[model samples]
Structures are given as structure tokens and as C-alpha cells.
Target: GRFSERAQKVLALSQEEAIRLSHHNIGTEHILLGLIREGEGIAAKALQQLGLGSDKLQKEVEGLVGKSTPHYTPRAKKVIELSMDEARKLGHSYVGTEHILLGLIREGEGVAARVLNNLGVSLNKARQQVLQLLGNN
Candidate 1:
């Protein structure tokens, strides 16, 4: 279960965002903010390239729904595990924001996905941006 430094930071920030929102459960929406707020991770970069910057994202998410849990919702935890598979299948040992973004989209049934869809960042488009950013070694 190794995560990149930024990945670690993002997850930590997830907690902070949840707390800030006064939400007791760390839902998909909170995780989305963590990825957006982390700022420098590949997930954030890919999202930025895909036309989603942090502020509008945070604002949009808030518009939709939070009040944060110390624990993650079932689906939110799935994104965490899904992120691992995303990295593993890519032969990358560490998880990053890109994986998180993909996980969010892959999960595809959460409030964050709805928010992303409303904002024009579809799974296909998100995948395209990530591919562009992660070239062959």
C-alpha cells in the first residue's frame, strides 16, 4: 500500500476538507476536494488540463452537497482501493492523484462524478488527459 508523497498529502487533505465542511463522513465529494486542493499532484494537473481548477471545483461541489465523517463512505473507500488497481495495472508501484481521478470516474456513481459530469469532465476525457500527461518511461 505505497502511495506517492503527494498522494499521501491528498488523502490527508481529504480529511481536512471533510472536517472543514463539517461533514462527518468522508464521502466521494470530500475526496474530490482533496485531489483538487492538493494542487501539485498529477491528478490536480490532469484535472486542470481537463478544464477543472480548484476553486470552481470546490465551489461547485459545495453547491451540490456536506457537513465530514472521520471515516470514509463505502464508495469513497472503493476509490481508495480502485486507485491501487489503477496504479498496479499501469505497473506503477505508487498511487497518485491521477489514479484517484480515474478511480472517481471509474466508480461513476457518486456525487463527485455527477459534479464532474456537469462540469464537462467525462471519464473518457479524463482518461485522455491523463494519458497525455503520463508518457512512456
Candidate 2:
């Protein structure tokens, strides 16, 4: 509900990514793609630390999930809810990309988490980076 400007951009990007992929439903991987595509968000920066840029992420996602008309997965919806919780925990009034990153890490079993893991981006490590980035901002 209370999403920051960047967070809103991330969501819009996610939808666009899904459309580009010809996917009907938004999934965690699409969300990851969105974060990467946002480029200037904290999530992008944290992912960059893992040597992942938007191109790399998009390639990986495209390789995994191809064109299709689908529906939003339950796990994906949960990540959004968890992101809100993360913002609340951090005493943030609005959900940001950092909170989305935290939610992806916390979701653990999602495709986004697995993608991050494959990229050597551990949840704890990502969490720490996000916190550090948030502090700097």
C-alpha cells in the first residue's frame, strides 16, 4: 500500500518485465528482474555487489522463465506482504526497494532467492548489504 517512489517503479518494472517475457502472472523472478532493471535502487546496488547487473539478471530470468500468459504466484504475493513487514520493522513509513530486497531474502524458497544464491548472493550477506546501503542513504 505505502510504497516509496522507487518501490513503485520497481512494481511497474516488474509488470513490464512480465509483459516482455510474455508471462501473464508476476513471479518472484519477475520481481528480481524488476529490481535489477530499476538499476538505481538499493536492491540494484546490492545485487551489483554480487556482480549482477540488469542485463545479467534479465538473461538469467529469460533463460529460466520464457514467454507465457500466466498468473501471479502465491509466493510472489507473499513477498510483497513481507516487504511491507520489512518496512514496518525498519520503522520506515513507505516500502522501498531495500525492503523488497529484504523480503526476497526472507522468502528464502522463492526463485528470486535461488537466483541470488546461484549468483553467490546469500540471504544474510544481502541483508547486511541492504542495511548498509540504507544507512548510507
Candidate 3:
């Protein structure tokens, strides 16, 4: 519920990306992909630098489908919960993009990492970018 009541209006812009990235078959990678596409805050932007965008992720899906196959179960809310936990653990006054990236990185075996792995996106790169951005703050 971090989105706040009536937040759907703001979320609307990002939800489409979120849904598209959501794991339609097995994992939550799609959701993480969506978060990258959301690119609203620092973490998201850092992900974008790695080309973890929706268009790229979708291509990975298609590429893998022609080979050995895997079934998928969707789990979008799980990432959200993980993100909140990261925020609490960090004692951050407010959850922001850094927490989101950390959550996805720390919460393994999720769709986000699967998609990211396929795309050759590295969490380390994103973290570095986020740290650089934070230097000004």
C-alpha cells in the first residue's frame, strides 16, 4: 500500500510496464523488468543504463522460447513486499529507488533476475550508478 490511496492515477503510467514485465509463465522477472522501465527514480534509471528495458526483456523471452522451455507462475506483489523489507532494514526514512534495486538483488529466484540475466544486465552496474547519483544528495 505504499502507493497510497488514489495512487492508481500515478501508477497508471507505470503499471503497464509493470504488467508487461510481470512473469506470464513462471517468475517475477517481468515485474522487475517493469520496474526498470518505470525508470521514475534513481534505481530505475540505473537499471535503464543496463538496457533492462521492456523492449529488450521481451526479446529475451522470445529468444528463449524457441529452445528448452520452462513454465512460469506469476508473482508481482512479492517484489513489492521485498522492497518494503529492504527499506525497513536500511532504516531509510522513505523507500526509494535504491531500496527497490536492493530488494530485487537480495531476493533471489525471482522473475526479475531471470529476465535480467538473460539480458546480460548486472545488478552491480546498477548499484554503482545509484551510488554515483546519491553522491549529489
Candidate 4:
């Protein structure tokens, strides 16, 4: 709820991804899906550049984490909170999708990070891409 418009869409889309996948809890993977679904955002662009379109990433995420009941894992909460911190640290007044993505990677041990790593995407690369795209905007 404490996010920018685009960041809030990422959260809402994440819940949709979780529900569609039959998962009750919105995990980091769900957040990743949300980011992908928010296609106009920097996070989505970074994911696309890494060859992780929503469809492809959704399939992989489904395989990695199955459907469950609605809940937010502690780590997921941490990631969300960290996004706010990241935004503030970067001197941004509002939390954005880019900040959320950076938070997920900084969390370091979530399904999102694991999936990204498996796809040869690293935190540094993702961060750089987000910054570059933000600059262009």
C-alpha cells in the first residue's frame, strides 16, 4: 500500500499471478511475476532484457513454487520493506518497480533470485539495466 502507482500495480499483479497459479501466498516469485506483468516499468524491461517474459517466467515459477493459500512469507515482507529503504537511499520519494526489483535481489535467497540466477541474470546487471532505463525516462 505504501508504494508508487506503478509499484502498487506490481503488487496487485503479483496477487493475480499468485491466484492464477493457485497459490494463496504472494511470495517473491509472485512479486517477480508482478514486475513482469507491469510491462511499462523498469523492472519489466530488465526482466525482458534477461529473456524472462511473463509467460516464460510464469511457467518456471509455477514449477518452482506451487499454488498455496494467501499469505506473505517473512522474506517477502522483508523484500517489500527493503524496497522502501532502497527508494529512500536512492533519494527517490516514492517506491517504484525498480526499487522492488533491487530489493528482491538484495534479499539474496528468495525464489526470485534463484530463478534469475539460473537464467544468467545477476543483481549487478539488473540494477544497471534499471538505472539505464530510468535515465532514459
Identify the candidate with maximal TM-score.
1
| Candidate that beats the other on lDDT, 1 or 2, i.e. the better one | 2
Off by over 4 Å in 2: 68-71
Candidate 4 Cα errors over 4 Å, as ranges? none
Which regions of candidate 1 deviate over 4 angstroms? 66-69
Clashing residue pairs in candidate 1 (N, C-alpha, C atoms within 3 angstroms): 22-67, 22-68, 23-67, 23-68, 23-69, 24-68, 24-69, 25-68, 25-69
**Model 4: lDDT of residue 128:** 83
lDDT of 2 by residue, 1-137 (tens): 69999999999999888888887889999999989889898898988876888888888777666565556689988899999999999999899998988888899887787777777777898899888877883
Please identify which of the two predictions, 2 or 3, would achieve the higher lDDT against the true structure: 2
**What lDDT score is found at residue 40 in candidate 1?**
89
How well is each residue in 1-137 modelled by candidate 3, as lDDT tens digits? Answer: 36422222223433553344342343455445445555566666667666566576657754554312333343445655676777677666455656656666766555566666766767666556666776655
TM-score of every candidate relative to the true structure: 0.92, 0.91, 0.62, 0.91
Task: Assess candidate 3 and give its lDDT.
Answer: 0.55
What TM value does model 3 have?
Answer: 0.62
Shift of residue 104 alpha carbon in model 2, Å = 1.1
